[PDB]
């Protein structure tokens, strides 16, 4: 049979082919990105997994380690569900707690209402 395989942050169960496209279930704290193709992979009668289409990604606040999604260490953030690691808190910010999506700005600092969360804070 085809082995139970964890690949692309998604679990693919052990499966037997048929004389065989199977979908993958996203792993804990990983999700399918909004406009993206869901994890699918093909099983072959010789016991081989073939042509992986699509992937899951670690959601905000989590990053990819081995083949799991793990919380951002305190001091780091990840605001989108991207292929990136956790990013260190930017200039003029305060150390974030675990699983952070952004870092709080420092007393006396702000980021304009337009600016994203991956941006340094500026003097008010």
């Amino acid at each position, epitope marked *: 049979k085809c082995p139970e395989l964890l690949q692309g942050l998604a679990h693919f169960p052990e499966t037997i082919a048929g004389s065989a496209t199977v979908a993958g279930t996203c792993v804990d704290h990983a999700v399918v990105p909004p406009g993206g193709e869901e994890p699918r992979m093909h099983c072959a009668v010789d016991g081989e997994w073939l042509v992986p289409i699509g992937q899951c990604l670690c959601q905000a606040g989590y990053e990819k380690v081995e083949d799991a999604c793990q919380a951002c260490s305190p001091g780091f953030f990840k605001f989108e569900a991207s292929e990136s690691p956790c990013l260190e808190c930017p200039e003029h910010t305060l150390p974030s707690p675990e699983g952070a999506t952004s870092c709080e700005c*420092e007393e006396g600092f702000f980021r304009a209402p337009q600016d994203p969360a991956s941006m340094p804070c500026t003097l008010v």
Partner: antibody, heavy 115, light 111 residues
Framework: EVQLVESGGGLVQPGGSLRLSCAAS????????MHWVRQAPGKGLEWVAS????????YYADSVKGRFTISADTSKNTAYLQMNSLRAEDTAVYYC????????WGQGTLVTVFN | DIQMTQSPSSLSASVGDRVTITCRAS??????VAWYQQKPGKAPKLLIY???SLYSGVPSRFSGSRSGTDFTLTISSLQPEDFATYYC????????????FGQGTKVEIKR
């Protein structure tokens, strides 16, 4: 395994110049801040310079500002510290470390300024 | 330049004891404080980050605490491998202010 291997330290005369390298394996220099921390013989750690390819900033301690230049080449995952107008107090072991809370350090390289 | 005053500069202790090194910052520095151990001839090792969080792999006997500006590192039962020198470092603002270190505490064996 994240690794930092430094090189370039050694003997140099005042006013001469020297360049230290920091080759990194196991992670991407672009996605990380890198810092240089020096230790004079018998003293504690002193910060020297910092670099973030991502946010694009190069920061120096007040005591070395304008004589050293920090740089990095994300292709070769290597950060450089160029030391110019070298003085007696610049004699120290120079370390490169990753992140502000520095979780991985290089082994160090010894810079000796001799008259 | 936020000064980091480390106390004490030296202490002698027996194996198993509770060691407590203190570091008072000149300003509010949030939790942007870290602790390192250096054995002679070797590079420092991160011990505690965000003033209270254990790095991965550091033995559980190490801990860090905050109250306002006074950060304290504590060793619950000193083991023989913990005879070394310790540094507090603050990194407040993640680069917006100079990274400054404590001056160090050397922990020696009582005899």
């Amino acid at each position: 395994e994240v690794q930092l291997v430094e090189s370039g330290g050694g003997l140099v005369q005042p006013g001469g110049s020297l360049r230290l390298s920091c080759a990194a394996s196991g992670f991407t220099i672009y996605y990380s801040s890198m810092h240089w921390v020096r230790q004079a013989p018998g003293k504690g750690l002193e910060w020297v310079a910092s670099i973030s390819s991502y946010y694009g900033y190069t920061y120096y301690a007040d005591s070395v500002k304008g004589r050293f230049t920090i740089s990095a080449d994300t292709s070769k995952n290597t950060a450089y510290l160029q030391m110019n107008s070298l003085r007696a107090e610049d004699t120290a072991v120079y370390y490169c470390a990753r992140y502000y809370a520095m979780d991985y350090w290089g082994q160090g390289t010894l810079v000796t300024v001799f008259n | 330049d936020i000064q980091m005053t480390q106390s004490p500069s030296s202490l002698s202790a027996s194996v198993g004891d509770r060691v407590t090194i203190t570091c008072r910052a000149s300003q509010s520095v949030s939790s942007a404080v870290a602790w390192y151990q250096q054995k002679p001839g070797k590079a420092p090792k991160l011990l505690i980050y965000s003033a209270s969080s254990l790095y991965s792999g550091v033995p559980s006997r190490f801990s860090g605490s905050r109250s306002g500006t006074d950060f304290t590192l504590t060793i619950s039962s000193l083991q023989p491998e913990d005879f070394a020198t310790y540094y507090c470092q603050q990194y407040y603002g993640y680069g917006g202010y100079p990274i400054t270190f404590g001056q160090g505490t050397k922990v020696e064996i009582k005899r």
